[PDB]
From TrEMBL:
Alphabetized UniProt keyword annotations: Metal-binding, Zinc
Binding locations of Mg(2+) 3: C132
Organism: Candidatus Cloacimonetes bacterium ADurb.Bin088
Name used for this protein in its record: CRISPR-associated protein Cse1 (CRISPR_cse1)
Covered residues, full protein: 180 to 357 of 535
Ligand binding (Mg(2+) 1): C39, C132, C135
RNA sequence: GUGAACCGGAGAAGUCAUUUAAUAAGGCCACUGUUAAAAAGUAUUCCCCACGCAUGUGGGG
């Protein structure tokens, strides 16, 4: 839904800096540099698995702190899907079918892999000629703002990530590289 | 005009206090430096230059 809060389109991209902090290694400014019609979907698909804790609005997502993600490789895309093809007993419920779908404590694969930790609404394209700040290809239309407001997951949810790694009690094993 | 361009790991700090290397020793016994010479009674003094050439005078290194 269209929440009244307005945020720049660069908040969904981690490598591109946003409000506060610094802007070195990526010389951009808010609301003047936008995203094309593919990088917006790139940012949208990154929501359920790489959502950071943040400041106020500590609730990150179904995995809290993002852990290591391990999966088996191949040499072709159709081949790549075969190694990691592990159907479960129940295929949960759709979470991208236009339904927010308040479920029970136990969740499923289709409702887990497509989580939406934040309400998101993208504004209409703006005419122009400039390129985006992620892939850099010149285009005709760009998106410059979005409506983002934080949402907390229900406490005590039961969900084991198929590609996650846990230490001893379900706590996420992150990367301790500084 | 190159995952590149633009870019300090920076500010600060007595290792100070105590201590004999001390007590002793013979380097001792043996050994010719010997055999040879005039600085002076010579027969060409190692080199240059003036003169007329009866084992000639003068001058300089
Ligand atoms: Zn792009």
């Amino acid at each position: 839904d269209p929440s009244s809060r307005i945020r720049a389109i660069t908040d969904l991209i981690h490598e591109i800096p946003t409000a506060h902090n610094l802007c070195h290694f990526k010389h951009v400014t808010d609301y003047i540099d936008g995203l094309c019609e593919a990088c917006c979907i790139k940012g949208l698909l990154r929501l359920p698995v790489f959502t950071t804790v943040g400041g106020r609005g500590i609730g990150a997502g179904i995995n809290n702190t993002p852990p290591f993600y391990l999966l088996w490789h191949a040499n072709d895309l159709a081949g790549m899907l075969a190694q990691n093809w592990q159907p479960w007993d129940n295929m949960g419920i759709p979470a991208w079918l236009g339904s927010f779908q308040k479920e029970s404590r136990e969740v499923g694969l289709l409702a887990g892999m497509t989580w939406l930790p934040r309400k998101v609404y993208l504004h209409d394209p703006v005419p122009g000629q400039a390129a985006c700040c992620s892939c850099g290809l010149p285009s005709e239309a760009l998106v410059y703002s979005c409506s983002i407001e934080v949402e907390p997951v229900p406490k005590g949810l039961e969900w084991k990530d198929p590609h996650g790694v846990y230490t001893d009690q379900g706590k996420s094993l992150q990367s301790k590289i500084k």
